[PDB]
Amino acid sequence: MLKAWHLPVAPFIKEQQERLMITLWLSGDDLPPRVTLRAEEDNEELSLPMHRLRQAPHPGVVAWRGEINLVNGQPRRRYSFKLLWADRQLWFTPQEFNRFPPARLEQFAVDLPDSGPQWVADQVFYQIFPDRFARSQSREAEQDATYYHHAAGHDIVRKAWDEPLTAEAGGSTFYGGDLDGISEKLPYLKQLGVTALYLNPVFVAPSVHKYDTEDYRRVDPQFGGDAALLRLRHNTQKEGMRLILDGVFNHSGDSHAWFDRHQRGSGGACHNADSPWRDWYNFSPEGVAHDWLGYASLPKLDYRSSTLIDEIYGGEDSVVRHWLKAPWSMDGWRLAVVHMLGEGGGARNNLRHIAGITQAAKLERPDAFVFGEHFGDARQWLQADVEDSAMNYRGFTFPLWGFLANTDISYDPQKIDAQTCMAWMDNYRAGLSHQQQLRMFNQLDSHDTARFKSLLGKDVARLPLAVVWLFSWPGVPCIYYGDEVGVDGNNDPFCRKPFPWDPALQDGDLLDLYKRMSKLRKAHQALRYGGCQVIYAEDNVVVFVRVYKQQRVLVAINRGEACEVVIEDSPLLDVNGWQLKEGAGALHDGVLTLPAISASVWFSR
């Protein structure tokens, strides 16, 4: 019966003289005579009175306003609305109306003052698995050589760029991409709209993926060494691009001097009880060192050790800070396996240690961006503010895998409609403040998944829909290298093909779409800072609007046959008019005419 609107952004909120003004919109025939702003100060629940505004913001809509005092309390301002009649109450939340009180951690929330990395919302990221992206022209003879991969039991193998990928020696096959290759491709990346790089590991390590860290203080010479990473840092700085390295601190590689399984230097932890780093690893009674999910090449680090803590993040000279200060001056860290890191061979005290890693990073570099790898549900980590963001597999990737590709994290069959997809995406982000939502690291696939283009199988025509959605859902988008020219393949090792630089092997129409979406995101504040209201979500169609001050961006996605959808009048959609910017959809008199398998974007004028 009753209708309500609120988003944690202007025009609904406004900061004014140490006060956060909060406005709620209501419409209906049985309007509550009172409305309480339920807010919070230092975790104490507050009942703040709201007053009816004289001016109707839109026809048939009543506005209520309250104020959060900003001089006291913690920066994250949580709130919801308690509608009050003579005999009853009803809550309005990020997940519509609730008959019983919402969870404290599923309210609306705004971070004021926001101390997070505010530049993230303005970025378009691009993830590069360096061995497979680009070989520098002044390439490597000594770094196209071979050596013995102890953990693998044999020599690494070299392959030419057009040699097909095989399941054989997946961690030991090198196509020879390097960091100067990335530098040389910055014009391509700038042309794509990319403003920021996330690199898979680049420190000294024997494998091709290099999560088996051997030296945390040196860049692998295979990728061009320290010199080539200094050049990449310079070249991205010159082009105004951000640069994030992969930080692998849950475990080291078993060839690291601290562990030294293959006794390259008398042995650290594995074959020495008096080793200096003996207590940096955990050894069972049964003789198996604790490792990452049973991979002996990845011995887990024991953060009970106060010397290890100092080495990774506690000290001024710690690894986390080393790469964030000059000459390196990286922009932050992607935290590999952020969720298992801890003490005693497991995740004991994990949240404290992640909080310490992030704190150490911001100490060296206040605007550093620290986000964690979360295949699972990151909400406990983000709700405790131990990191800025997560790889948003649960809140973005897997909803799209189910709705568009009928599959999921385990490649189990999925059958979810638009209702369920959007309930899923909105439930997840209800756990996050607006500022957190805007910096969630969103991607369609990664070096640890099958390529989304392949997951679509016979429904590959849906791929452009996911691209539009990637650039218009709250979060910072990350392109996985090659996705934009149509690279496909199954999961690891097959998701890491060498990038096809031959334009004959490139999907140019897909490339152009990525370019156009990056321009729209760069152009429109609501696509970077806006709130997000799902307007319509039924069967094959999702419609949502991004909202920022007076601006609106309407997005309509239709995964199935051509159809028409009626959009009820909404005060969020009450604009002078709409300009179609991308896609073939059409809007007229509240009727969306949506072609089959299409995504469309309108800007309000």
Ligand X SMILES: C[C@H]1O[C@H](O[C@H]2[C@H](O)[C@@H](O)[C@@H](O)O[C@@H]2CO)[C@H](O)[C@@H](O)[C@H]1N[C@H]1C=C(CO)[C@@H](O)[C@H](O)[C@H]1O
Positions touching ligand X (CB under 6 A) are: 170-171, 209, 211, 292, 295, 298, 336-337, 373, 447-448, 492
- As a three-state string, the secondary structure of 286-349 is CCCECEECCEEEEEEEECCCHHHHHHHHHCCCCHHHHCCCCCCCCCEEEECCCCCCEECCCCEC
* CB of residue 48 to a second copy, shortest distance in Å: 12
Coil, strand or helix at 505 = helix
Which position among 8, 73, 482, 530 is part of the footprint of a second copy (CB under 8 A)?
Answer: 73
* Residue 406 binds: one of ligand X, a second copy, none (C-beta under 5 to 8 A by kind): a second copy
DSSP 532-599: EEEEEEETTEEEEEEEETTEEEEEEEE-SS-EEEE----GGG--S-EEEEESS-EEETTEEEE-SSEE
User: Strand, coil or helix: what is 383?
Assistant: helix
Task: Between 385 and 445, name the residue whose CB sits nearer to a second copy.
Answer: 385
Q: Which is nearer to ligand X, 126 or 292 (CB)?
A: 292
Q: Is the dihedral of CA 540, 598, 545, 605 positive or negative?
A: negative
In this chain, which of 21, 157, 363, 423 binds a second copy, going by CB under 8 A?
423
Indicate which of a second copy, ligand X, none lies near residue 439 (CB less than 5 to 8 Å, by partner kind): none
Where does this chain touch a second copy (CB under 8 A) — which range of 335-343, 449-457, 515-523, 531-539? 335-343
Residues in Cβ contact with 37 at an 8 Å cutoff, skipping those fewer than 6 apart: 22, 46, 47, 48, 49, 50, 66, 67, 68, 79, 81, 82
Residue 119 C-beta: closest distance to a second copy, Å: 25
Tell me if 20 sits within 8 A of 112, measured CB to CB. yes
**Cα torsion angle, 185, 187, 193, 196, sign:** positive
Give the number of residues in contact with a second copy, rule: CB under 8 A. Answer: 59
Q: Which of 61, 416, 460, 586 binds a second copy (CB under 8 A)?
A: 416
Q: Residue 595 interacts with a second copy (CB under 8 A)?
A: no
> From residue 29 to residue 68, what is the string marking binding to a second copy with x (rule CB under 8 A)?
-------x----xxxxx-x---------------------
Structure tokens at 383: 């709700």
> Is residue 446 within 8 Å of residue 482, measured between CB atoms?
no
Contact with a second copy (CB under 8 A) among 235, 272, 406, 490? 406
CB nearer a second copy, residue 173 or residue 350: 350
What sign does the dihedral 566-570-576-578 (CA atoms) show? Answer: negative
**Residue 306 within binding range of a second copy, rule CB under 8 A:** no
DSSP-derived 3-state class of residue 248: coil
Location of structure tokens 């001056």 = 329
Residue 177: CA count within 13 A, CB half-sphere: 26
Nearer to a second copy, 341 or 527 (CB): 341
Instruction: Name the binder of 72 from ligand X, a second copy, none, CB < 5-8 A by kind.
Output: a second copy
Residue 209 three-state SS:
coil
Report the partner that residue 171 touches, choosing among ligand X, a second copy, none (CB closer than 5 to 8 A by kind).
ligand X
Q: Six-digit token pair at 433?
A: 């403040």
82 touches a second copy by CB under 8 A: yes
Binding window for a second copy (CB under 8 A); candidates: 51-59, 349-357, 358-366, 524-532: 349-357
Taking the complex as a whole, how short is the minimal distance between the CB of residue 378 and ligand X, in angstroms? 14
Output the six-digit token pair for 394: 């649960």
Would you say 212 and 205 are in contact if contact means Cβ atoms under 8 Å apart? yes
- What x-and-dash track marks residues 182-221 binding a second copy by CB under 8 A? ----------------------------------------
- Residue 162 near residue 148, CB atoms below 8 Å: no
Instruction: Based on the shown chain and the rule CB under 8 A, indicate whether residue 402 belongs to the binding site for a second copy.
Output: yes
x/- track of binding to a second copy for residues 89-118 (CB under 8 A): x---------xxx-xxx-------------
Dist CA 468 CA 461 (whole Å) = 13
Q: Which residues of 119-141 are buried (b: 16+ CB within 10 A; e: fewer)?
A: ebbbbbbbbbbbbbbbbbeeebe
Select from a second copy, ligand X, none the partner in contact with residue 329, using the beta carbon and a kind-dependent cut-off of 5 to 8 Å. Answer: none
Subset of residues 368 to 387 that bind a second copy, contact rule: CB under 8 A: 375-377, 379-380, 383-384
Task: Please give the residue ranges that form the binding site for a second copy (CB under 8 A).
Answer: 36, 41-45, 47, 72-74, 82, 84-89, 99-101, 103-105, 293, 339-340, 342, 345-348, 350-352, 375-377, 379-380, 383-384, 394, 398-399, 402, 406, 408-410, 412-416, 420-421, 423-424, 427
